[PDB]
Design an enzyme around this catalytic site. Structure first.
Site, PDB file in Angstrom:
ATOM      1  N   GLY C  54       0.771  -1.229   0.000  1.00  0.00           N
ATOM      2  CA  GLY C  54       0.000   0.000   0.000  1.00  0.00           C
ATOM      3  C   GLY C  54       0.802   1.280   0.000  1.00  0.00           C
ATOM      4  O   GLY C  54       0.206   2.361   0.059  1.00  0.00           O
ATOM      5  N   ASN C  90      23.406   6.172   2.023  1.00  0.00           N
ATOM      6  CA  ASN C  90      23.642   4.846   2.554  1.00  0.00           C
ATOM      7  C   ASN C  90      24.631   4.041   1.725  1.00  0.00           C
ATOM      8  O   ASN C  90      25.200   3.076   2.246  1.00  0.00           O
ATOM      9  CB  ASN C  90      22.305   4.087   2.657  1.00  0.00           C
ATOM     10  N   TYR C 155      38.167   1.774   5.369  1.00  0.00           N
ATOM     11  CA  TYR C 155      36.766   1.971   5.735  1.00  0.00           C
ATOM     12  C   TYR C 155      36.617   2.992   6.854  1.00  0.00           C
ATOM     13  O   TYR C 155      35.759   3.881   6.775  1.00  0.00           O
ATOM     14  CB  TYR C 155      36.137   0.646   6.153  1.00  0.00           C
TER      15      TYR C 155
HETATM   16  N1  LIG Z   1      26.072  -3.909   8.311  1.00  0.00           N
HETATM   17  C1  LIG Z   1      26.771  -3.311   9.266  1.00  0.00           C
HETATM   18  O1  LIG Z   1      27.139  -3.895  10.266  1.00  0.00           O
HETATM   19  C2  LIG Z   1      27.102  -1.842   9.062  1.00  0.00           C
HETATM   20  C3  LIG Z   1      27.406  -1.025  10.102  1.00  0.00           C
HETATM   21  C4  LIG Z   1      27.738   0.262   9.818  1.00  0.00           C
HETATM   22  C5  LIG Z   1      27.159   0.818   8.691  1.00  0.00           C
HETATM   23  N2  LIG Z   1      26.787   0.100   7.720  1.00  0.00           N
HETATM   24  C6  LIG Z   1      26.587   0.758   6.393  1.00  0.00           C
HETATM   25  O2  LIG Z   1      25.393   0.271   5.858  1.00  0.00           O
HETATM   26  C7  LIG Z   1      25.326   0.648   4.505  1.00  0.00           C
HETATM   27  C8  LIG Z   1      24.839  -0.568   3.745  1.00  0.00           C
HETATM   28  O3  LIG Z   1      24.488  -1.604   4.676  1.00  0.00           O
HETATM   29  P1  LIG Z   1      24.993  -3.107   4.591  1.00  0.00           P
HETATM   30  O4  LIG Z   1      26.139  -3.354   5.520  1.00  0.00           O
HETATM   31  O5  LIG Z   1      23.815  -3.989   4.849  1.00  0.00           O
HETATM   32  O6  LIG Z   1      25.660  -3.226   3.121  1.00  0.00           O
HETATM   33  P2  LIG Z   1      25.231  -4.071   1.810  1.00  0.00           P
HETATM   34  O7  LIG Z   1      24.441  -5.227   2.313  1.00  0.00           O
HETATM   35  O8  LIG Z   1      26.478  -4.191   0.992  1.00  0.00           O
HETATM   36  O9  LIG Z   1      24.361  -2.922   1.170  1.00  0.00           O
HETATM   37  C9  LIG Z   1      25.230  -1.901   0.518  1.00  0.00           C
HETATM   38  C10 LIG Z   1      24.535  -1.379  -0.714  1.00  0.00           C
HETATM   39  O10 LIG Z   1      25.129  -0.132  -1.188  1.00  0.00           O
HETATM   40  C11 LIG Z   1      25.247  -0.280  -2.596  1.00  0.00           C
HETATM   41  N3  LIG Z   1      26.222   0.608  -3.210  1.00  0.00           N
HETATM   42  C12 LIG Z   1      27.584   0.593  -3.069  1.00  0.00           C
HETATM   43  N4  LIG Z   1      28.187   1.518  -3.754  1.00  0.00           N
HETATM   44  C13 LIG Z   1      27.161   2.184  -4.392  1.00  0.00           C
HETATM   45  C14 LIG Z   1      27.143   3.282  -5.274  1.00  0.00           C
HETATM   46  N5  LIG Z   1      28.249   3.892  -5.658  1.00  0.00           N
HETATM   47  N6  LIG Z   1      25.944   3.712  -5.747  1.00  0.00           N
HETATM   48  C15 LIG Z   1      24.853   3.079  -5.324  1.00  0.00           C
HETATM   49  N7  LIG Z   1      24.752   2.036  -4.514  1.00  0.00           N
HETATM   50  C16 LIG Z   1      25.941   1.634  -4.070  1.00  0.00           C
HETATM   51  C17 LIG Z   1      25.549  -1.746  -2.765  1.00  0.00           C
HETATM   52  O11 LIG Z   1      26.314  -2.196  -3.859  1.00  0.00           O
HETATM   53  P3  LIG Z   1      25.916  -3.246  -4.983  1.00  0.00           P
HETATM   54  O12 LIG Z   1      25.348  -2.618  -6.251  1.00  0.00           O
HETATM   55  O13 LIG Z   1      27.319  -3.758  -5.165  1.00  0.00           O
HETATM   56  O14 LIG Z   1      24.966  -4.274  -4.329  1.00  0.00           O
HETATM   57  C18 LIG Z   1      24.469  -2.360  -1.897  1.00  0.00           C
HETATM   58  O15 LIG Z   1      23.185  -2.432  -2.519  1.00  0.00           O
HETATM   59  C19 LIG Z   1      26.737   1.207   4.180  1.00  0.00           C
HETATM   60  O16 LIG Z   1      26.933   2.621   4.185  1.00  0.00           O
HETATM   61  C20 LIG Z   1      27.641   0.564   5.248  1.00  0.00           C
HETATM   62  O17 LIG Z   1      28.854   1.290   4.961  1.00  0.00           O
HETATM   63  C21 LIG Z   1      26.907  -1.269   7.795  1.00  0.00           C
END
Ligand SMILES: NC(=O)c1ccc[n+]([C@@H]2O[C@H](COP(=O)([O-])OP(=O)(O)OC[C@H]3O[C@@H](n4cnc5c(N)ncnc54)[C@H](OP(=O)(O)O)[C@@H]3O)[C@@H](O)[C@H]2O)c1
Ligand SMILES: NC(=O)c1ccc[n+]([C@@H]2O[C@H](COP(=O)([O-])OP(=O)(O)OC[C@H]3O[C@@H](n4cnc5c(N)ncnc54)[C@H](OP(=O)(O)O)[C@@H]3O)[C@@H](O)[C@H]2O)c1
Ligand SMILES: NC(=O)c1ccc[n+]([C@@H]2O[C@H](COP(=O)([O-])OP(=O)(O)OC[C@H]3O[C@@H](n4cnc5c(N)ncnc54)[C@H](OP(=O)(O)O)[C@@H]3O)[C@@H](O)[C@H]2O)c1
Ligand SMILES: NC(=O)c1ccc[n+]([C@@H]2O[C@H](COP(=O)([O-])OP(=O)(O)OC[C@H]3O[C@@H](n4cnc5c(N)ncnc54)[C@H](OP(=O)(O)O)[C@@H]3O)[C@@H](O)[C@H]2O)c1
Lengths: 234, 235, 236, 234
Positions: C54, C90, C155
């Site tokens: 929705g 993000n 990072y």
């Molecule tokens: N998970 C954790 O523990 C943690 C903690 C701190 C913060 N975060 C942050 O959470 C965010 C993402 O969460 P996640 O850990 O669940 O990561 P994820 O599963 O890798 O999701 C990251 C996403 O960002 C996309 N992306 C990367 N570069 C991009 C660009 N230039 N343009 C558009 N999209 C782009 C991805 O790339 P693809 O096209 O390659 O899929 C993917 O869809 C990030 O900023 C990460 O740095 C993560």
């Protein structure tokens, strides 16, 4: 290290980290005044050691948690030496319990004796150091004051309050070149696990951090908290 | 916002930030318990305003700095409502004065009132919320406790000690889902406004909404945090 | 939560935390623009799931590290939508290794992709939100940016840079009521580590997403330049 | 201050704060390597002044932002002296401008030049200091990396990234006793108004803070960000 000042008062300095600060500062040529409250044997022993290495040392008895007592002590030092260049607020106790087992009495004891002592010291430093446009004050804080700990609600309250109060004092003394700073020791000599440097800190490492913050080498630093914890907390 | 909990106690909730916190959480469906020490004229007026607007509100009495008084009101509230979900340690005074003009009397009054009180509140929150495996406590600190101020050695000591004590409490209550967090407001209603990037004073209501967030379910993974509400004055 | 604004662009939103921000903001009545870079399928599945529930949702393809793409996508949303109220930077990548094993290639890739993208996002947000005197931007940082970590020099560099740059953006956007804030998640579920977390569990993606919502919502109207820690006590 | 190590490289050290850091570490007994990119006049002038004052000092030409060229420089120093005890990442540029006026070229230049150079310095330091299990690196950051500033999105990004990357390097070097620490100077020789100490900082006070962090006196300090700003930010 290089000191424009000539003397330093260290609260609670008869043993442990306070004694080591006394030892370090006297080996750098300052006349150290070693505070003690109760039995004088250990303070007299430290003063004898420090003179016998060729240094300048005196002992002084007062309760740092008593306003009158600690104001009159600083007045006596002013009258003997001509002034007071440096202060180290090191007096402190611990009474750890879980909070649910802690009477407000157990909280008030630690708060009074750890924070109000430092407040008295810093205010009296402001008074006696203002005329000469020169002074440095170091508050021995703790890592517990920055992160907190189980069973240390009182202690962490006192030493976080010390960290913030010291900055207020820095604001008030800065226009007459009276600097205030905190040192946060970590674990000083299982717990060693989480320390990246993989060892406890020696009291001397704390003492040389203090020496740096009193010295002329830190003449632009004021209002800062210097972690001395081997990486345990960044 | 969403609340799994049901009721909140707010110390010093009769006026100012405490009262407008009270309005805020009442409007979101919580039963508020205003706490007061002196006159009940404004507290009762608040309570009535909150019940006309259709919300649940009551009042209660203690000197939040008094151990017995604090505790005993918390049992009263547990007996009335069956429990206490949320607590806000808001009670606090100022007695500003340069340090050299400040008797240790003026220092103990502020320490005892602003931070011993938060200690009783937090320790008792731990007690009443442990059973049910749920709770949220917010301590109302200040930017002064983070940065210090000229003329505010006592206030900055109290609020900085709160901020650190809050973290210790978060440690002690984390295993039982009792979360502890602090809020550090800035200047809340011209030369003062020069150093605020948002170029205005904060409304008491923005502080109240930050408090609501830290109490709500939306912050269920946030404990031991200090949430700055100062319009950019301090980063 | 209450939102005065109407739509939001989330970069890197096709899966994980970004997908959960999209889901949460959609369920609060915002029209979410789901960004993706490569394969659409996962993004169009997310859009369809949100529309079935929705909610309003669209997908948009662009490389957040490309100045031209990200400019032009924001321009397209402004023309479909009338403007852009909220932005969530993000997009981020990881390339963990020890530093002595890390080329400068491996450093720029993570920098150029985690920081510069946020820089473009925040600068375009300033532009497109200035006139209406309203806007909120959240930068998804990390606990690594606050505390540093073995093997994550690149990072942590990118996320600490994001955290500080976000404060500068708060300074520049504060007069037109354009707020800038950061979220620093800890370890989020996707058990050695759960040791050092006081809450004794990984976080859920939805807990991060709700913190983001709060920093976008009206309830945080006086909070700018802040870094909101979502880590269950792992770092205070 | 004492130093167990014998030598120190300083990037961007031909003038300003880097020159003063060279001057200060030279007078304390260290052999200083004065890095420069462009004209060698001013760096030779610095070298000749330090050698005039009785000290060991050598110039070295390299672009700190270039991986091959600053890896090779470290290697040449290792061959001349036998090793490298200390590093100071000081190379830095500013290109201040409002964000809406700033091309990503303008952002990339400052990033690549301020943060990548520090990365190349800290990794190579990890490499060359690991065998001896001794070393100290100081990254000169800024107060802007801690609070931000209007017109300085790029500079603040580079310097705050430097501050966090330095903690990451501290984690990686801790076990080998290679320490990493940052310095965040404030305003260094209206503005003054907001400084409690009511004056600008001398390059000389920054340089002595750096010296303390390199010295043996900070041997239990790693991962720290030492503020040198006269109370401007606490
Ligand atoms: N998970 C954790 O523990 C943690 C903690 C701190 C913060 N975060 C942050 O959470 C965010 C993402 O969460 P996640 O850990 O669940 O990561 P994820 O599963 O890798 O999701 C990251 C996403 O960002 C996309 N992306 C990367 N570069 C991009 C660009 N230039 N343009 C558009 N999209 C782009 C991805 O790339 P693809 O096209 O390659 O899929 C993917 O869809 C990030 O900023 C990460 O740095 C993560
Ligand atoms: N060791 C650590 O890991 C650690 C780390 C953080 C900071 N520190 C700080 O280090 C300082 C002391 O070091 P320590 O751990 O080695 O403690 P210690 O061995 O107990 O030395 C503390 C000293 O302070 C004295 N003292 C207490 N209250 C006093 C007062 N009101 N007036 C005068 N003297 C007073 C002592 O009491 P008595 O007369 O009872 O002997 C004793 O001589 C404290 O500020 C503590 O809070 C400790
Ligand atoms: N306004 C700001 O700029 C600012 C910023 C930082 C945080 N805050 C915090 O805001 C809170 C109150 O907000 P406010 O500034 O708007 O202050 P306010 O107008 O003075 O409201 C404070 C209230 O707390 C009550 N109180 C004090 N001690 C108490 C005790 N022991 N038990 C119960 N109630 C007690 C008051 O005392 P009476 O019975 O004497 O009326 C009053 O109702 C405080 O915690 C202050 O520390 C203020
Ligand atoms: N002064 C302050 O208020 C302040 C406060 C915070 C930190 N600091 C830091 O202090 C350092 C410089 O001090 P300063 O302000 O006195 O600056 P300065 O006068 O510009 O000195 C900077 C020096 O670094 C050199 N440099 C730049 N990039 C380099 C590279 N890639 N390789 C080698 N050398 C390079 C310079 O470039 P050229 O070849 O172009 O001469 C110059 O010799 C920087 O890290 C700055 O970011 C400054």
């Amino acid at each position: 290290m290089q000191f424009t000042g000539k003397n330093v008062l260290i609260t609670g300095a008869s043993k442990g980290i306070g004694a080591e600060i006394a030892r370090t500062l006297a080996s750098m040529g300052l006349k150290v005044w070693i505070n003690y409250r109760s039995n004088a044997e250990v303070a007299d022993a430290l003063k004898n050691e420090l003179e016998e290495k060729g240094y300048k040392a005196a002992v002084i008895k007062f309760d740092a948690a008593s306003e009158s007592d600690f104001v009159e002590a600083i007045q006596a030092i002013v009258q003997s030496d001509g002034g007071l260049s440096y202060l180290v607020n090191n007096a402190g106790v611990v009474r750890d319990k879980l909070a649910i087992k802690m009477k407000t009495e157990d909280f008030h004891h630690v708060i009074d004796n750890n924070l109000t002592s430092a407040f008295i010291g810093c205010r009296e430093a402001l008074k006696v150091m203002s005329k000469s446009r020169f002074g440095s004050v170091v508050n021995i804080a703790s890592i517990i004051g920055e992160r907190g700990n189980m069973g240390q609600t009182n202690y962490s309250a006192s030493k976080g309050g010390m960290i913030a109060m010291s900055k207020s004092f820095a604001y008030e003394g800065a226009l007459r070149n009276i600097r205030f700073n905190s040192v946060t020791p970590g674990f000083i000599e299982d717990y060693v696990k989480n320390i990246p440097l993989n060892r406890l800190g020696a009291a001397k490492e704390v003492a040389e951090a203090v020496a740096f913050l009193l010295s002329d080498h830190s003449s632009y630093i004021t209002g800062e908290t210097l972690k001395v914890n081997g990486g345990l907390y960044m």
